Copies of this chain bind each other. A is one copy, B any other.
Amino acid sequence: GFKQDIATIRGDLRTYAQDIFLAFLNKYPDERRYFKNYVGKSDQELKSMAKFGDHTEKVFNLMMEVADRATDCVPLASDANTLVQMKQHSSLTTGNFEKLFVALVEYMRASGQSFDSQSWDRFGKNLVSALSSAGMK
């Protein structure tokens, strides 16, 4: 289930984080706009850029904490507030998050690993709703 999935991802975090984020950027190429020095680079080029690995790990470290802190895939309001208020997220709207989670769920369904993809879909919806309540456009 969802709780087990958090442990699965945490068990090989850097790999899942990079693979899911690349799935995101490749599925929504327009989204790469938000990521300066990621433009014009293949997957392998990105995976050799120390900054890409470091930042994507930090993203998924936090995402797993938000997931772990959730009840029935509904995140804490405080976690949503943090995601809205972070300076790094000043240019984002909830559509950006919707996209990330569509890609994540797709990645999970396509994988050999047994994820509860439906729970992740709900988590992404509930996170988006929480972002909206916290004031993201």
Contacts and interface: CB of A to CB of B under 8 A. Distances in A.
Contacts of A39: 1
Contacts of A44: 7
Contact of A72 (B1, B7, B40): B40
Contact of A1 (B2, B3, B23, B32): B32
Interface stretch (A13-21, A78-86, A91-99, A112-120): A112-120
Nearest to A119: B29
Contacts of A2: 29, 40
25 contacts: A1-B25, A1-B26, A1-B29, A1-B32, A1-B39, A1-B40, A1-B41, A1-B42, A2-B29, A3-B40, A3-B42, A4-B26, A4-B42, A4-B43, A6-B42, A7-B43, A7-B44, A23-B114, A26-B114, A26-B116, A27-B114, A29-B118, A30-B118, A40-B71, A40-B72
